[PDB]
Amino acid sequence: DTKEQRILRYVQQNAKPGDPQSVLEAIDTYCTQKEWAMNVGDAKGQIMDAVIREYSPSLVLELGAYCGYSAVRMARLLQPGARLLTMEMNPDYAAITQQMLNFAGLQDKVTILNGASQDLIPQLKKKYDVDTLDMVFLDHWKDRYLPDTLLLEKCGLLRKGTVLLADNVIVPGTPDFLAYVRGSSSFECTHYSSYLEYMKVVDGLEKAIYQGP
Ligand SMILES: C[S@@+](CC[C@H](N)C(=O)[O-])C[C@H]1O[C@@H](n2cnc3c(N)ncnc32)[C@H](O)[C@@H]1O
Ligand SMILES: O=[N+]([O-])c1cc(O)c(O)c([N+](=O)[O-])c1
Ligand SMILES: [Mg+2]
């Protein structure tokens, strides 16, 4: 099996069905202790929670679902009637995300869009009944943040007050995106400093005592 199947299995065997907080904790525990994985993680996740609670978005777009950690993190805080749309181009990952959402009981709040954001964004208004977005979470391949921001703007999906929230602007880094939005009068920016998750990296010394030939 894959790492992603192992994460899901761990959740199924250890988390409480229908309990999003339990699902999050199980993922964080497994990736902290057993296998590193590229979920946003609990430290930055707490910052996401605070931002979502401040703006109470009715319509959120996520770029990059992976195993569904951030989709569970965000969707659990949405008010009744609110929606998360999440784009994922890897169908194996999208399958895990759907199962993760099902297990957490959030499947009615979240819709998975299968495909590449650059192909899907222009289809949003028509196929998913979108006027403008209230919030966007960017966490896909880092070279796509700036071109997808420009594409969102072109497609008329941003309104005054739409909140973009971008992961990894330091590590691995998103230098073009970060320079662009900080420099542009079309964006007012705030930085929330944190730490990359799952960085308790096990290593060790081997002692090898020569016994002779
Ligand atoms: C860092 S992981 C997402 C982690 C997730 N946001 C979380 O915190 O649980 C990055 C994901 O973006 C997907 N991806 C990369 N480029 C993409 C694109 N252009 N459109 C859609 N998905 C993309 C990758 O397949 C991968 O699953
Ligand atoms: O390599 N990493 O540490 C990361 C961390 C992350 O949080 C990522 O989103 C990532 N990625 O999308 O490729 C990679
Ligand atoms: Mg990330």
Determine, yes or no, domain membership for 208: no
Cα 77 to Cα 33, 48, 53, 81, 111, distances in angstroms: 26, 10, 7, 12, 16
Q: Which of 48, 61, 89 to probe ligand 1 with, by most ligand atoms within 8 A of CB?
A: 89
Determine, yes or no, domain membership for 111: yes
Determine, yes or no, domain membership for 206: no
Q: Rounded CA gap, 150 and 15, in Å?
A: 39
Q: Rounded CA gap, 55 and 109, in Å?
A: 17
Domain carrying residue 136:
1-201
Annotation says 154 is catalytic = no
Determine, yes or no, domain membership for 210: no
The pair of three-digit structure tokens given for residue 64, joined into one six-digit string: 């990059």
Determine, yes or no, domain membership for 207: no
Name the experimental technique: X-ray
Cα 157 to Cα 120, 135, 150, 172, 188, distances in angstroms: 12, 10, 10, 27, 17
Determine, yes or no, domain membership for 81: yes
Resolution in A: 1.6
* Catalytic entry in 127, 168, 206, 207: 168
What CATH number is given to the structural domain containing 137? 3.40.50.150
Name the domain count of the chain. 1
Annotation says 197 is catalytic = yes
